[PDB]
Amino acid sequence: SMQDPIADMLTRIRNGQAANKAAVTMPSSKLKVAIANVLKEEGFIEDFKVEGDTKPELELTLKYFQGKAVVESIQRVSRPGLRIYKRKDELPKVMAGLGIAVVSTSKGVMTDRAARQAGLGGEIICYVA
Amino acid sequence: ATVNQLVRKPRARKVAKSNVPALEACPQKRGVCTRVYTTTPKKPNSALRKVCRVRLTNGFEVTSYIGGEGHNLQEHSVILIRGGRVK
RNA sequence: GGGAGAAGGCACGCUGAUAUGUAGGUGAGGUCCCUCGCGGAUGGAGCUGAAAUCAGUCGAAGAUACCAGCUGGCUGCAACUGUUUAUUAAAAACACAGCACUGUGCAAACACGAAAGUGGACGUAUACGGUGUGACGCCUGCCCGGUGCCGGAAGGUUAAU
RNA sequence: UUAGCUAGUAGGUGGGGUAACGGCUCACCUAGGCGACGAUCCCUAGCUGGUCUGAGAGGAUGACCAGCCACACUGGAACUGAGACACGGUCCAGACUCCUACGGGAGGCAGCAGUGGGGAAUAUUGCACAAUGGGCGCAAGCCUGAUGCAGCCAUGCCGCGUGUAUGAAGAAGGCCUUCGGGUUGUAAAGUACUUUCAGCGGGGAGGAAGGGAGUAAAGUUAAUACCUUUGCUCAUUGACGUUACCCGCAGAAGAAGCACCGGCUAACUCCGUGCCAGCAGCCGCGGUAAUACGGAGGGUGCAAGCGUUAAUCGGAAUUACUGGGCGUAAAGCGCACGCAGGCGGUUUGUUAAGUCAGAUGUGAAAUCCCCGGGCUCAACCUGGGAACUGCAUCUGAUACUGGCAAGCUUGAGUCUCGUAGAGGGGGGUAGAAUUCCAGGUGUAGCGGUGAAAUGCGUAGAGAUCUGGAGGAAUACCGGUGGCGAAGGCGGCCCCCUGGACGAAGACUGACGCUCAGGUGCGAAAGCGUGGGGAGCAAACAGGAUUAGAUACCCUGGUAGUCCACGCCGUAAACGAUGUCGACUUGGAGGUUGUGCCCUUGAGGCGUGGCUUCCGGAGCUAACGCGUUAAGUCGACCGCCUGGGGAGUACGGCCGCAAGGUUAAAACUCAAAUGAAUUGACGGGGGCCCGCACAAGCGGUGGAGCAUGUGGUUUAAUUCGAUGCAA
RNA sequence: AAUACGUUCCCGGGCCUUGUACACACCGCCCGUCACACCAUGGGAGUGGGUUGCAAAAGAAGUAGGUAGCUUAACCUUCGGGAGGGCGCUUACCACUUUGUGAUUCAUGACUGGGGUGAAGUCGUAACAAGGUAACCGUAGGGGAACCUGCGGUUGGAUCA
RNA sequence: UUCUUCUAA
């Protein structure tokens, strides 16, 4: 049943944009926060609110612009059936670099343009555009 | 199309064959005339197509269209074929 | 299950070694127990003794004599083991397990018997008698006009009376 | 449609053997070894750098150059030697050829030429060791069919010509024409100019540098012998060679051709031709006016070549890793189970495997790329660089994925009370119906069809009542209800038994998902033994029916339908939608729980499970789906790849068989196909009209003649019209 | 003059509607035996090749081992011999070659099975509309041919005081 | 109740 919480997360983001919701909540993970603390920093969400003691629940705030949405695309690169590990030179450019690609390297979670300036590759999670 | 199925079984690209097998990947092959005759074609056209039954080099017995208008062909004659179907 | 000993091929004597008797079999005198016996263990002398290997060695040939399968391929018929023309015919004939029909409620049907009675059967319809067919596999069509059989009782016919 | 393979096999011990280790070999032990990550077997094949295509991913490919390997008439074996199982060595067997006095011998072009052969097709018994090397020698040298040259083929890649200006009378002529003209066409003619190349004639580098001799000095030694080293002279060394390059010479001279014009795709007329001749990559042209045939003119495309065929990728995303789909266009197994398999909640450490980073090694050269250089450029040659996408090693890195431990409880699973149910087997039991049997009553028909008839009846049917027997199914309830994974399950009762849901809880600690191979279930018909057999009903029989009726209809009627136990394993087994998650507008229901509110009545507010219709976004080729997705995403499995052939052949598998199952190929076509639109049509449905029918009256068709047509006849019976509409 | 109740049917036309594989348009499309012709193929008594397994036979050359025999320039030496070598002998291995039996593959094969294809035949008209007995899946039976029929399922079927 | 067929441009 539960084969990924990450692909659960991005689709809950994806279906919440079209549903025009302001708050998408889900149970939280350590890796989930490490991604959610990028897109606020990268300016694709407005707020995330990690709460919950017995079980942490991540509650998001969707960023909307001029009525319509901000997240024009949200994907998954390394699926659980097929993992993706690209070096620092094979880091992509989402929408010719205008979008961002979330990569997890040994130095935590960052974006690809930071990882190029970090000069070290790793596991590409998803594409956000 | 699941990659595990793609792992357990590769994509079988379909293998195509020649429509002109008697030349056996040659440009032209020598032949011997066996019977020279005419043949009515199929429904949309009506003619007497001059044509010859040919014994080849490799023992194959094929038919091959006589192009042009008029010829001097006999049986037991040495000819040369290039290919091409007649529709 | 078989076919199949299919077919086909190899070894085979003797001498020595292994091991001057081996594998094995038998099994004392000993020894201990013993309810002590027409005992039990242990114990192994003794005798008996395969099979194999190795190395020699003889002939033309070593399952040397006697003894003791000719094999193969296709097809007919019958499935088979059987039975038979004593005394010119052993089979394709018969029988057969099997199948089908039919009869029969027991004092059975039926058979032998003038009869009594007996077999049936000290069996009771998963029983018994008869006929046809003859394993097994796949099957088994049509015709009741005829001939039989079965069922019917309206009418015609009709005995002794 | 190759699943089992192996006995020196696999391992050990010991001995032997080889340069070396090791069943390398042998002996003796052990029974191992291998395989679904494809062993085994079969088919094909020298391998790589590379080459070709492709944007890449890839695909194909291995001539030429390289690196390796293998082979040398065939089959064998050793020998020798550091190195051989030796192309140009031996020895044996074979084959073939040759010599012989017949006793015997000899022979190996896959070296370079060449000959024959085969073939669609691939060159000279060419020259020369000058250079470059290689072998021997102190050297000189000797040899080299290695090597450097020439011939040969538009075999390929390049570079170059076959002139340049001018020239309208728009010449002639051709073609075409609206006969006016147009076009060929500045094209040619003519004029002025140029002489590249080829040719001819003359001239004239580099590749020839080295080395070689004679000499000088130094070193070495007793040496000023020799020798060595370094200077100096004499000569050189060229096969190509009549070189590269340079001047003369002469004239526009000696030098352009294929393919194409219907669309696809750049470029049209005319004339011949008449489904003939033909054309043809595809669609398709020719059946008297052809831009598609043939010819001409004109034009387009290329060019010393131009076409066709072959052959490979691309286009082709048409196997979709990049980069596909499976509701109906091909495609989700009939479902369920489940191993291997792949996949995995959460949190903490650990590990550092994967992963990432760095560094070393290697990834030969060539090639390709980039920057240069050289040949008059170009092709070509060549310098440097990058690249060679890898692999090995070392140093890290710790987010994730693993590995290791510990936890947590949401996932998953128990415990507790209940709930609904055609959920399952087993055994009873009812009531109607039908059939049959028996009887009473009673009389002449019954039955069936569109009509009938076969049939059943006076031998008393049918009908009617009474009695009895038997099998099968269980009215009403009953429901776009219920349950089961489906296949499916329907009177009532009993016995055994399953699943689901809900409620409060308690617990467990990730215990999960999917699942090739495997296992089970699995409608109906069919099969096997037994049983049973009312009704019904293949086949079959009769009767109709019709042109025919092996059918539809009637009257019959058997397997079969029922039961017991087994086989088969297919169904439009359909929701034509595989399973388990998560998210995402609603409305109207059905069914089944369970809280609250006074149930203030059949009420309201909740909260679950399941299911039906509608429908938003979204998606969809459309149709539609639409919180039970054909929406958005996750995991894993099954499948698809033009149509026919064909789920067929041939093998295997399974079955008593029927068959099931696995699963092609040849050949053939350019379609097949899905939705949806417009018409048309329906022995489809509504609505309306018409001497359309019905209601009427008179006629035609009979008769004779008139008139017209057909036919026949004729020397000729001129021609045309010939359903309705001659 | 007669007569018209009426619109059930007939013929035609219009309109809405539905179905639909039709579209030179139901005088439409369409199917299968059969006859003829063409094309490849299955099967097939067999037949002829190729390849290979298997079991043995086979033993040239070669080498290795043994070696009665014959023999033997360097070395030992009493000069007699010593070892060794030669030659032959035999053994081991093995090529050529042979036997049988399989397997596999190609070719061929009287005859026979379908398949596909026809610009004109014969027979019927099953499907497309409610295609004039709705259609189709299974499975079974029948039948010149499409097909028919039985059981079960599907709608991917029309109809509705 | 019954009722079939329309070659090839």
mmCIF file of N, CA and C (backbone and C1' of nucleotides) in Angstrom, chain B residues 1-2 4-5 8 11-14 20 25-30 45-50 57 65 68-70 82 85-87, chain D residues 119-120 275-280 282-286 293 308-310 319-321 324-325 342 636-639 641-642 670:
data_model
loop_
_atom_site.group_PDB
_atom_site.id
_atom_site.type_symbol
_atom_site.label_atom_id
_atom_site.label_comp_id
_atom_site.label_asym_id
_atom_site.label_seq_id
_atom_site.Cartn_x
_atom_site.Cartn_y
_atom_site.Cartn_z
ATOM 1 N N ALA B 1 5.313 -2.733 -19.496
ATOM 2 C CA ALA B 1 6.202 -1.600 -19.694
ATOM 3 C C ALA B 1 6.904 -1.258 -18.392
ATOM 4 N N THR B 2 6.548 -1.986 -17.338
ATOM 5 C CA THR B 2 7.261 -1.889 -16.074
ATOM 6 C C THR B 2 8.693 -2.368 -16.268
ATOM 7 N N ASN B 4 10.874 -3.769 -14.417
ATOM 8 C CA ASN B 4 11.165 -5.138 -14.008
ATOM 9 C C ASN B 4 10.808 -6.127 -15.104
ATOM 10 N N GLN B 5 9.677 -5.914 -15.773
ATOM 11 C CA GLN B 5 9.372 -6.702 -16.957
ATOM 12 C C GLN B 5 10.352 -6.389 -18.071
ATOM 13 N N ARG B 8 13.398 -8.383 -17.087
ATOM 14 C CA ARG B 8 13.248 -9.806 -17.359
ATOM 15 C C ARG B 8 13.045 -10.100 -18.833
ATOM 16 N N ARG B 11 13.115 -5.413 -25.046
ATOM 17 C CA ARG B 11 12.256 -5.006 -26.150
ATOM 18 C C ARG B 11 12.665 -5.735 -27.418
ATOM 19 N N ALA B 12 11.771 -6.573 -27.922
ATOM 20 C CA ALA B 12 12.030 -7.296 -29.156
ATOM 21 C C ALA B 12 11.732 -6.381 -30.330
ATOM 22 N N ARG B 13 12.776 -5.791 -30.897
ATOM 23 C CA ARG B 13 12.604 -5.071 -32.145
ATOM 24 C C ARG B 13 12.316 -6.059 -33.258
ATOM 25 N N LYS B 14 11.292 -5.746 -34.045
ATOM 26 C CA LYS B 14 10.803 -6.677 -35.047
ATOM 27 C C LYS B 14 11.815 -6.800 -36.171
ATOM 28 N N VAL B 20 12.737 -9.309 -51.921
ATOM 29 C CA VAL B 20 13.431 -9.810 -53.100
ATOM 30 C C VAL B 20 14.506 -10.809 -52.677
ATOM 31 N N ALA B 25 20.865 -10.667 -51.370
ATOM 32 C CA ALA B 25 21.649 -9.446 -51.172
ATOM 33 C C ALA B 25 22.716 -9.266 -52.242
ATOM 34 N N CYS B 26 22.307 -9.266 -53.489
ATOM 35 C CA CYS B 26 23.169 -8.920 -54.600
ATOM 36 C C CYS B 26 22.529 -7.793 -55.401
ATOM 37 N N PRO B 27 23.311 -6.994 -56.129
ATOM 38 C CA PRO B 27 22.680 -6.016 -57.024
ATOM 39 C C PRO B 27 21.977 -6.649 -58.206
ATOM 40 N N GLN B 28 22.631 -7.555 -58.930
ATOM 41 C CA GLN B 28 22.029 -8.230 -60.070
ATOM 42 C C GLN B 28 22.469 -9.681 -60.051
ATOM 43 N N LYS B 29 21.635 -10.555 -60.607
ATOM 44 C CA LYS B 29 21.979 -11.965 -60.686
ATOM 45 C C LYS B 29 21.682 -12.490 -62.078
ATOM 46 N N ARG B 30 22.561 -13.360 -62.554
ATOM 47 C CA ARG B 30 22.430 -13.968 -63.868
ATOM 48 C C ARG B 30 21.307 -14.997 -63.837
ATOM 49 N N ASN B 45 -6.435 -2.896 -64.153
ATOM 50 C CA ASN B 45 -5.737 -2.715 -65.407
ATOM 51 C C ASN B 45 -5.887 -3.933 -66.301
ATOM 52 N N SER B 46 -5.835 -3.689 -67.601
ATOM 53 C CA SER B 46 -6.100 -4.741 -68.571
ATOM 54 C C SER B 46 -5.060 -4.650 -69.667
ATOM 55 N N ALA B 47 -4.147 -5.609 -69.692
ATOM 56 C CA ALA B 47 -3.081 -5.622 -70.679
ATOM 57 C C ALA B 47 -2.616 -7.059 -70.856
ATOM 58 N N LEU B 48 -1.617 -7.244 -71.704
ATOM 59 C CA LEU B 48 -0.863 -8.490 -71.773
ATOM 60 C C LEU B 48 0.579 -8.177 -71.413
ATOM 61 N N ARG B 49 0.938 -8.419 -70.160
ATOM 62 C CA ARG B 49 2.253 -8.041 -69.665
ATOM 63 C C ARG B 49 3.267 -9.104 -70.058
ATOM 64 N N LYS B 50 4.224 -8.720 -70.903
ATOM 65 C CA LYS B 50 5.276 -9.621 -71.359
ATOM 66 C C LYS B 50 6.178 -9.960 -70.181
ATOM 67 N N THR B 57 20.879 -18.406 -61.152
ATOM 68 C CA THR B 57 22.158 -19.015 -60.830
ATOM 69 C C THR B 57 22.013 -20.032 -59.712
ATOM 70 N N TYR B 65 9.562 -9.388 -64.854
ATOM 71 C CA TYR B 65 8.851 -8.618 -65.853
ATOM 72 C C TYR B 65 9.788 -8.079 -66.921
ATOM 73 N N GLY B 68 9.730 -2.227 -71.022
ATOM 74 C CA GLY B 68 9.787 -1.665 -72.351
ATOM 75 C C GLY B 68 8.640 -2.137 -73.223
ATOM 76 N N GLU B 69 8.826 -1.950 -74.527
ATOM 77 C CA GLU B 69 7.852 -2.356 -75.532
ATOM 78 C C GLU B 69 8.569 -3.143 -76.614
ATOM 79 N N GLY B 70 8.309 -4.442 -76.668
ATOM 80 C CA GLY B 70 8.944 -5.278 -77.664
ATOM 81 C C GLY B 70 10.331 -5.726 -77.255
ATOM 82 N N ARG B 82 17.186 -7.050 -61.937
ATOM 83 C CA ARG B 82 17.547 -6.014 -60.983
ATOM 84 C C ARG B 82 16.611 -5.966 -59.784
ATOM 85 N N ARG B 85 9.091 -5.060 -57.646
ATOM 86 C CA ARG B 85 7.852 -5.782 -57.859
ATOM 87 C C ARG B 85 7.045 -5.078 -58.934
ATOM 88 N N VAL B 86 6.134 -5.810 -59.540
ATOM 89 C CA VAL B 86 5.099 -5.219 -60.370
ATOM 90 C C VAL B 86 3.815 -5.265 -59.570
ATOM 91 N N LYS B 87 3.147 -4.130 -59.448
ATOM 92 C CA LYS B 87 2.005 -4.064 -58.559
ATOM 93 C C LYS B 87 0.806 -4.784 -59.141
ATOM 94 P P G D 119 28.569 -19.276 -61.911
ATOM 95 O "O5'" G D 119 28.332 -17.773 -61.462
ATOM 96 C "C5'" G D 119 27.953 -17.488 -60.131
ATOM 97 C "C4'" G D 119 28.595 -16.224 -59.650
ATOM 98 C "C3'" G D 119 28.303 -14.993 -60.476
ATOM 99 O "O3'" G D 119 27.044 -14.424 -60.203
ATOM 100 C "C1'" G D 119 30.602 -15.120 -60.078
ATOM 101 P P A D 120 25.987 -14.286 -61.395
ATOM 102 O "O5'" A D 120 25.807 -12.717 -61.563
ATOM 103 C "C5'" A D 120 26.008 -12.103 -62.823
ATOM 104 C "C4'" A D 120 26.490 -10.690 -62.664
ATOM 105 C "C3'" A D 120 27.970 -10.531 -62.387
ATOM 106 O "O3'" A D 120 28.717 -10.530 -63.587
ATOM 107 C "C1'" A D 120 26.714 -9.194 -60.887
ATOM 108 P P C D 275 -8.541 0.431 -76.362
ATOM 109 O "O5'" C D 275 -7.534 -0.072 -75.245
ATOM 110 C "C5'" C D 275 -7.662 0.378 -73.905
ATOM 111 C "C4'" C D 275 -7.219 -0.682 -72.938
ATOM 112 C "C3'" C D 275 -8.242 -1.777 -72.695
ATOM 113 O "O3'" C D 275 -7.555 -2.976 -72.360
ATOM 114 C "C1'" C D 275 -7.827 -0.648 -70.684
ATOM 115 P P C D 276 -7.641 -4.245 -73.332
ATOM 116 O "O5'" C D 276 -6.731 -3.845 -74.572
ATOM 117 C "C5'" C D 276 -5.319 -3.887 -74.477
ATOM 118 C "C4'" C D 276 -4.678 -3.497 -75.780
ATOM 119 C "C3'" C D 276 -3.169 -3.336 -75.758
ATOM 120 O "O3'" C D 276 -2.494 -4.569 -75.898
ATOM 121 C "C1'" C D 276 -4.158 -1.500 -76.879
ATOM 122 P P A D 277 -1.188 -4.874 -75.023
ATOM 123 O "O5'" A D 277 -0.137 -3.784 -75.507
ATOM 124 C "C5'" A D 277 0.492 -3.890 -76.772
ATOM 125 C "C4'" A D 277 1.204 -2.612 -77.122
ATOM 126 C "C3'" A D 277 2.212 -2.127 -76.097
ATOM 127 O "O3'" A D 277 3.479 -2.746 -76.216
ATOM 128 C "C1'" A D 277 0.786 -0.353 -76.668
ATOM 129 P P G D 278 3.995 -3.767 -75.086
ATOM 130 O "O5'" G D 278 4.543 -2.836 -73.914
ATOM 131 C "C5'" G D 278 3.724 -2.465 -72.812
ATOM 132 C "C4'" G D 278 3.715 -0.971 -72.638
ATOM 133 C "C3'" G D 278 4.162 -0.446 -71.290
ATOM 134 O "O3'" G D 278 5.570 -0.406 -71.169
ATOM 135 C "C1'" G D 278 2.206 0.679 -71.970
ATOM 136 P P C D 279 6.256 -0.660 -69.745
ATOM 137 O "O5'" C D 279 5.853 0.638 -68.916
ATOM 138 C "C5'" C D 279 6.344 1.937 -69.296
ATOM 139 C "C4'" C D 279 5.723 3.008 -68.432
ATOM 140 C "C3'" C D 279 5.945 2.863 -66.935
ATOM 141 O "O3'" C D 279 7.230 3.311 -66.512
ATOM 142 C "C1'" C D 279 3.672 3.370 -67.356
ATOM 143 P P A D 280 8.191 2.291 -65.744
ATOM 144 O "O5'" A D 280 7.732 2.451 -64.231
ATOM 145 C "C5'" A D 280 7.563 3.736 -63.661
ATOM 146 C "C4'" A D 280 6.514 3.710 -62.583
ATOM 147 C "C3'" A D 280 6.690 2.630 -61.532
ATOM 148 O "O3'" A D 280 7.568 3.042 -60.503
ATOM 149 C "C1'" A D 280 4.453 2.640 -62.310
ATOM 150 P P C D 282 5.083 1.225 -55.937
ATOM 151 O "O5'" C D 282 3.883 1.884 -55.131
ATOM 152 C "C5'" C D 282 3.756 1.675 -53.737
ATOM 153 C "C4'" C D 282 3.247 2.913 -53.055
ATOM 154 C "C3'" C D 282 1.902 3.417 -53.539
ATOM 155 O "O3'" C D 282 0.807 2.719 -52.987
ATOM 156 C "C1'" C D 282 3.410 5.218 -53.441
ATOM 157 P P C D 283 -0.336 2.161 -53.962
ATOM 158 O "O5'" C D 283 -1.336 3.385 -54.133
ATOM 159 C "C5'" C D 283 -1.918 4.005 -53.000
ATOM 160 C "C4'" C D 283 -2.334 5.415 -53.315
ATOM 161 C "C3'" C D 283 -3.369 5.562 -54.412
ATOM 162 O "O3'" C D 283 -4.683 5.364 -53.935
ATOM 163 C "C1'" C D 283 -1.613 7.117 -54.743
ATOM 164 P P G D 284 -5.737 4.536 -54.813
ATOM 165 O "O5'" G D 284 -5.907 5.414 -56.126
ATOM 166 C "C5'" G D 284 -5.557 4.885 -57.393
ATOM 167 C "C4'" G D 284 -4.592 5.778 -58.124
ATOM 168 C "C3'" G D 284 -4.875 5.961 -59.603
ATOM 169 O "O3'" G D 284 -5.838 6.961 -59.854
ATOM 170 C "C1'" G D 284 -2.608 5.413 -59.314
ATOM 171 P P C D 285 -6.643 6.947 -61.236
ATOM 172 O "O5'" C D 285 -5.551 7.336 -62.319
ATOM 173 C "C5'" C D 285 -5.891 7.357 -63.691
ATOM 174 C "C4'" C D 285 -4.730 7.793 -64.532
ATOM 175 C "C3'" C D 285 -4.828 7.418 -65.994
ATOM 176 O "O3'" C D 285 -5.638 8.299 -66.736
ATOM 177 C "C1'" C D 285 -2.711 6.801 -65.187
ATOM 178 P P G D 286 -6.958 7.732 -67.435
ATOM 179 O "O5'" G D 286 -6.392 6.865 -68.640
ATOM 180 C "C5'" G D 286 -5.597 7.480 -69.636
ATOM 181 C "C4'" G D 286 -5.146 6.501 -70.684
ATOM 182 C "C3'" G D 286 -6.207 5.611 -71.296
ATOM 183 O "O3'" G D 286 -7.039 6.272 -72.225
ATOM 184 C "C1'" G D 286 -4.306 4.326 -70.807
ATOM 185 P P C D 293 4.298 8.995 -68.790
ATOM 186 O "O5'" C D 293 3.751 7.886 -69.784
ATOM 187 C "C5'" C D 293 3.696 6.523 -69.401
ATOM 188 C "C4'" C D 293 3.344 5.669 -70.581
ATOM 189 C "C3'" C D 293 4.149 5.970 -71.828
ATOM 190 O "O3'" C D 293 5.385 5.291 -71.844
ATOM 191 C "C1'" C D 293 1.857 5.910 -72.373
ATOM 192 P P U D 308 16.947 6.733 -59.884
ATOM 193 O "O5'" U D 308 16.917 5.148 -60.004
ATOM 194 C "C5'" U D 308 16.029 4.522 -60.913
ATOM 195 C "C4'" U D 308 16.465 3.120 -61.241
ATOM 196 C "C3'" U D 308 16.634 2.185 -60.062
ATOM 197 O "O3'" U D 308 15.412 1.652 -59.595
ATOM 198 C "C1'" U D 308 18.494 1.982 -61.498
ATOM 199 P P U D 309 15.235 1.318 -58.036
ATOM 200 O "O5'" U D 309 16.105 0.006 -57.819
ATOM 201 C "C5'" U D 309 15.726 -1.219 -58.421
ATOM 202 C "C4'" U D 309 16.826 -2.237 -58.316
ATOM 203 C "C3'" U D 309 17.295 -2.552 -56.910
ATOM 204 O "O3'" U D 309 16.460 -3.469 -56.235
ATOM 205 C "C1'" U D 309 19.166 -2.170 -58.292
ATOM 206 P P A D 310 16.205 -3.287 -54.664
ATOM 207 O "O5'" A D 310 17.555 -3.801 -54.005
ATOM 208 C "C5'" A D 310 17.972 -5.141 -54.192
ATOM 209 C "C4'" A D 310 19.407 -5.332 -53.792
ATOM 210 C "C3'" A D 310 19.759 -4.879 -52.395
ATOM 211 O "O3'" A D 310 19.394 -5.823 -51.411
ATOM 212 C "C1'" A D 310 21.389 -4.099 -53.900
ATOM 213 P P U D 319 9.290 0.815 -32.728
ATOM 214 O "O5'" U D 319 8.418 0.414 -31.467
ATOM 215 C "C5'" U D 319 8.629 1.056 -30.223
ATOM 216 C "C4'" U D 319 9.191 0.107 -29.200
ATOM 217 C "C3'" U D 319 10.570 -0.486 -29.506
ATOM 218 O "O3'" U D 319 11.311 -0.585 -28.298
ATOM 219 C "C1'" U D 319 9.024 -2.217 -29.137
ATOM 220 P P A D 320 12.226 0.638 -27.824
ATOM 221 O "O5'" A D 320 11.212 1.642 -27.144
ATOM 222 C "C5'" A D 320 11.480 3.027 -27.164
ATOM 223 C "C4'" A D 320 10.295 3.804 -26.679
ATOM 224 C "C3'" A D 320 9.541 3.210 -25.511
ATOM 225 O "O3'" A D 320 10.196 3.427 -24.279
ATOM 226 C "C1'" A D 320 8.034 4.086 -27.117
ATOM 227 P P C D 321 10.738 2.186 -23.421
ATOM 228 O "O5'" C D 321 11.852 2.833 -22.491
ATOM 229 C "C5'" C D 321 12.335 2.163 -21.339
ATOM 230 C "C4'" C D 321 13.434 2.962 -20.695
ATOM 231 C "C3'" C D 321 13.360 4.455 -20.951
ATOM 232 O "O3'" C D 321 12.492 5.113 -20.053
ATOM 233 C "C1'" C D 321 15.560 3.688 -21.352
ATOM 234 P P G D 324 7.046 6.821 -22.538
ATOM 235 O "O5'" G D 324 5.824 6.241 -23.383
ATOM 236 C "C5'" G D 324 5.236 7.036 -24.398
ATOM 237 C "C4'" G D 324 4.326 6.257 -25.318
ATOM 238 C "C3'" G D 324 3.041 5.710 -24.730
ATOM 239 O "O3'" G D 324 2.047 6.687 -24.507
ATOM 240 C "C1'" G D 324 4.000 4.094 -26.134
ATOM 241 P P G D 325 1.032 6.505 -23.277
ATOM 242 O "O5'" G D 325 0.250 5.153 -23.591
ATOM 243 C "C5'" G D 325 -0.977 5.181 -24.302
ATOM 244 C "C4'" G D 325 -1.392 3.822 -24.811
ATOM 245 C "C3'" G D 325 -2.277 2.993 -23.899
ATOM 246 O "O3'" G D 325 -3.631 3.397 -23.919
ATOM 247 C "C1'" G D 325 -0.598 1.624 -24.846
ATOM 248 P P G D 342 14.978 -9.532 -6.011
ATOM 249 O "O5'" G D 342 14.309 -8.094 -6.031
ATOM 250 C "C5'" G D 342 14.244 -7.377 -7.246
ATOM 251 C "C4'" G D 342 12.906 -6.721 -7.450
ATOM 252 C "C3'" G D 342 12.526 -5.632 -6.476
ATOM 253 O "O3'" G D 342 13.216 -4.422 -6.696
ATOM 254 C "C1'" G D 342 10.665 -7.000 -6.862
ATOM 255 P P C D 636 7.944 -1.901 -8.778
ATOM 256 O "O5'" C D 636 7.605 -3.390 -9.197
ATOM 257 C "C5'" C D 636 7.596 -4.401 -8.209
ATOM 258 C "C4'" C D 636 6.365 -5.250 -8.306
ATOM 259 C "C3'" C D 636 6.021 -5.743 -9.690
ATOM 260 O "O3'" C D 636 6.817 -6.829 -10.093
ATOM 261 C "C1'" C D 636 4.069 -4.988 -8.596
ATOM 262 P P C D 637 7.153 -7.007 -11.643
ATOM 263 O "O5'" C D 637 5.915 -7.833 -12.193
ATOM 264 C "C5'" C D 637 5.593 -9.084 -11.616
ATOM 265 C "C4'" C D 637 4.174 -9.487 -11.906
ATOM 266 C "C3'" C D 637 3.812 -9.652 -13.368
ATOM 267 O "O3'" C D 637 4.240 -10.884 -13.906
ATOM 268 C "C1'" C D 637 2.111 -8.452 -12.244
ATOM 269 P P G D 638 4.648 -10.976 -15.452
ATOM 270 O "O5'" G D 638 3.256 -10.963 -16.218
ATOM 271 C "C5'" G D 638 2.331 -12.022 -16.045
ATOM 272 C "C4'" G D 638 1.024 -11.736 -16.733
ATOM 273 C "C3'" G D 638 1.116 -11.296 -18.178
ATOM 274 O "O3'" G D 638 1.354 -12.360 -19.075
ATOM 275 C "C1'" G D 638 -0.373 -9.885 -17.051
ATOM 276 P P C D 639 2.372 -12.149 -20.295
ATOM 277 O "O5'" C D 639 1.570 -11.221 -21.304
ATOM 278 C "C5'" C D 639 0.332 -11.654 -21.832
ATOM 279 C "C4'" C D 639 -0.441 -10.514 -22.431
ATOM 280 C "C3'" C D 639 0.185 -9.867 -23.643
ATOM 281 O "O3'" C D 639 0.004 -10.623 -24.821
ATOM 282 C "C1'" C D 639 -0.652 -8.201 -22.194
ATOM 283 P P U D 641 0.487 -8.111 -30.937
ATOM 284 O "O5'" U D 641 0.316 -7.329 -32.303
ATOM 285 C "C5'" U D 641 -0.265 -6.032 -32.303
ATOM 286 C "C4'" U D 641 0.651 -5.022 -32.934
ATOM 287 C "C3'" U D 641 1.824 -5.617 -33.707
ATOM 288 O "O3'" U D 641 2.068 -4.848 -34.882
ATOM 289 C "C1'" U D 641 2.629 -4.174 -32.015
ATOM 290 P P G D 642 1.979 -5.551 -36.324
ATOM 291 O "O5'" G D 642 1.034 -4.599 -37.185
ATOM 292 C "C5'" G D 642 -0.129 -4.024 -36.612
ATOM 293 C "C4'" G D 642 -1.213 -3.785 -37.632
ATOM 294 C "C3'" G D 642 -2.030 -4.991 -38.042
ATOM 295 O "O3'" G D 642 -3.025 -5.316 -37.096
ATOM 296 C "C1'" G D 642 -1.427 -3.774 -39.959
ATOM 297 P P A D 670 -3.083 -3.717 -52.536
ATOM 298 O "O5'" A D 670 -4.022 -2.501 -52.129
ATOM 299 C "C5'" A D 670 -5.093 -2.687 -51.212
ATOM 300 C "C4'" A D 670 -5.018 -1.754 -50.025
ATOM 301 C "C3'" A D 670 -4.371 -0.388 -50.269
ATOM 302 O "O3'" A D 670 -4.998 0.575 -49.432
ATOM 303 C "C1'" A D 670 -3.275 -1.464 -48.508
#
